[PDB]
Write a protein that binds this ligand. Sequence first.
Ligand SMILES: Cc1ccc(CN2CCS(=O)(=O)CC2)cc1
Ligand SMILES: Cc1ccc(CN2CCS(=O)(=O)CC2)cc1
Ligand SMILES: Cc1ccc(CN2CCS(=O)(=O)CC2)cc1
Ligand SMILES: Cc1ccc(CN2CCS(=O)(=O)CC2)cc1
Ligand SMILES: Cc1ccc(CN2CCS(=O)(=O)CC2)cc1
Ligand SMILES: Cc1ccc(CN2CCS(=O)(=O)CC2)cc1
Ligand SMILES: [Zn+2]
Ligand SMILES: [Zn+2]
Ligand SMILES: [Zn+2]
Ligand SMILES: [Zn+2]
Lengths: 360, 360
Amino acid sequence: MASMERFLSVYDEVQAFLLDQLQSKYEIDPNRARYLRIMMDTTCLGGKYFRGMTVVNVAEGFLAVTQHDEATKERILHDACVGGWMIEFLQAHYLVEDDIMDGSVMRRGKPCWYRFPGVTTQCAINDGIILKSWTQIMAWHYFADRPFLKDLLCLFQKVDYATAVGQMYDVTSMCDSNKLDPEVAQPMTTDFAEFTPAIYKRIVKYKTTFYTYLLPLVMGLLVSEAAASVEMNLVERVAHLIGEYFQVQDDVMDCFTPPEQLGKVGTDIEDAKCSWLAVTFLGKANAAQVAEFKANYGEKDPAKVAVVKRLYSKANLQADFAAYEAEVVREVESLIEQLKVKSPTFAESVAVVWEKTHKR
Amino acid sequence: MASMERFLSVYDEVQAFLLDQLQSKYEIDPNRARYLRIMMDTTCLGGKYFRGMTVVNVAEGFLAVTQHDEATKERILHDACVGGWMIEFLQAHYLVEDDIMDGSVMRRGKPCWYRFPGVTTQCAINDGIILKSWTQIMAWHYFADRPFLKDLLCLFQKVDYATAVGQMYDVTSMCDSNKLDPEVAQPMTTDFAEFTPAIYKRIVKYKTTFYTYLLPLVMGLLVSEAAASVEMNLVERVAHLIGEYFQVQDDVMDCFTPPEQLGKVGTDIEDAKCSWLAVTFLGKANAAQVAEFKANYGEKDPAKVAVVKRLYSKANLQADFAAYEAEVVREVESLIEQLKVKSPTFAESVAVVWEKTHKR
Ligand SMILES: Cc1ccc(CN2CCS(=O)(=O)CC2)cc1
Ligand SMILES: Cc1ccc(CN2CCS(=O)(=O)CC2)cc1
Ligand SMILES: Cc1ccc(CN2CCS(=O)(=O)CC2)cc1
Ligand SMILES: Cc1ccc(CN2CCS(=O)(=O)CC2)cc1
Ligand SMILES: Cc1ccc(CN2CCS(=O)(=O)CC2)cc1
Ligand SMILES: Cc1ccc(CN2CCS(=O)(=O)CC2)cc1
Ligand SMILES: [Zn+2]
Ligand SMILES: [Zn+2]
Ligand SMILES: [Zn+2]
Ligand SMILES: [Zn+2]
């Protein structure tokens, strides 16, 4: 069976299981089940499934080099699909809540879930809670007797928690740290002293790399019983590196990809986000450029947003991006090679993850 | 040591552990740690700790009848405190998010967390996520090698999930089921056909009884290694019964307790909630009363809210409440007795839980 149709089939299976259980154990009525069905589909489906399919691809890599009965191949692949959906539904939780937190309008060319007329914020906050609760119910049902249950649940939680800490670092990235205070409304920084490469790398490490790259790779190892084919410090290092590059790309696209292809109107400028473009621009600007940036950034006024975009274009950030890209290519290739000391197979899955990111 | 000072001490311990770990493992800076500290205190502290202290009291009950080394008594009590905080922090998650979902102003005579000036909804949604993530980090740290870890984590998840399903039943309780539809803005029911005792009991069972009464009782059994001193179907039955009574009391207080003592201005009428008062009123009203209720319920207009309160007062709902209370007293005493077949001790803890609820 091809991997993607397997993965999509298991979605239907898992959906049916969740909804059936709601009717048999939680007293749900058919109409609320239908609401939840539609919510699940709307929030979990229509992406590329990169994350969840990475679990499947890592497991397929090991299957090719490990002896197993056919029934065991099938079980491993089924477990990789269930694990992949756990990550997809965890992402769906994040996207639902982040869209509400940010006041976002669109995502992938459709309205954010909370904006649907019969949803509203009141229900959407809790729908997003249910999305993450479903990752747990999947795990406890499908993995009940698996030797990797403990390790998978402990990994998932730590990744979830890193991700929420990353969200805190992102939402507070334009405040001055020393002014953070629940009692006092938070002003935008005026110095931008915290718009540094290291502070940027911390936001991105936590907010996206743990759930986007570390979790799918490590979940593929766990369902394969293969965590001894790797040196875990290398897997962390490479996940955090590729993940950062991925986010740099998104940051650049927020500013410069047309909204039709981007799937939304990018607002990182208006939102005063600590983006790669802002940090890179500040890292090369002269005094007059810095002052122009300060006078215009973090404002809704379209004229001011256009002043920032013009500053970025004139500053030749494409060159800084090429230099960054080159360095990432170097270090990701060095880590892949270190990963072959223990598993050629795992190293190749990491190569493929790299190729999908670099050349999307 | 007295139980409550033990419990409060462990709060300080757990807080220090969480914040220390954020600095050693998650790259947090001192100012963000302070924000999180203040968030934790603000959202977790200042209640009665009923839930968390019930775990401690169940464990203290068993300790009095079971032989153990002193160091084991201490470990069991420490584990009961950590488990109790897991429930308190899970409640804090619920209250933070519910206050945002409902647009609430106050809770326990102070502003809702999201209303604090330096918080805002954007940060508060994620603070509430972190609250629940912390229940997991507590568990994996303090219970890493405990024989009850699996059972405790599986119980916690199912309780969390029931609670979120209960929130869905609550937020949708004034819609007609057959009209639920993400695509269509939801009208208030005009027939109130779904304001029944059974539908009410389903909302309340899920939204509060699993986390308020079942989880503390069962967590006390788990940290005591005492789940064989009970018949679990009886523990469920009694938890769901006491929990329902608790919520009926809250529903009555929302309408009739002065806001100063209630800790907030009650809005269940304006919010069109399926409250015990509404369901009981509809269960005895004549046609003219029903029509007056329909014309006034679920409106912000204070004059209309006063018309509903007047209908309730004239309908002698205090008598229906006394009749309900009497019946609950009967059934809770019958269940306590059934609980003595296997554990006098556990039955007495349930008696105390009952006494704290009935006579608060
Ligand atoms: C010990 C060992 C022997 C052979 C192989 C290759 N193998 C072919 C048959 S299979 O269906 O098991 C898929 C992988 C790997 C390991
Ligand atoms: C409450 C909450 C916690 C974490 C996240 C992380 N999220 C990942 C996806 S992202 O980078 O698109 C937007 C941030 C979101 C919400
Ligand atoms: C810093 C920088 C890097 C690259 C580009 C070019 N850009 C790449 C792909 S895109 O969809 O973002 C639109 C075109 C511009 C600026
Ligand atoms: C087998 C058994 C013997 C005695 C007891 C009572 N016991 C007193 C001493 S203690 O500190 O262990 C607390 C409970 C219970 C069980
Ligand atoms: C997102 C979410 C899920 C569940 C709850 C349950 N909560 C219990 C406490 S309550 O009855 O006060 C208000 C409802 C809240 C929020
Ligand atoms: C249905 C019903 C029951 C009891 C009461 C009396 N009430 C009890 C406590 S209270 O703080 O809600 C205010 C006074 C009135 C109506
Ligand atoms: Zn965001
Ligand atoms: Zn972005
Ligand atoms: Zn609510
Ligand atoms: Zn209430």
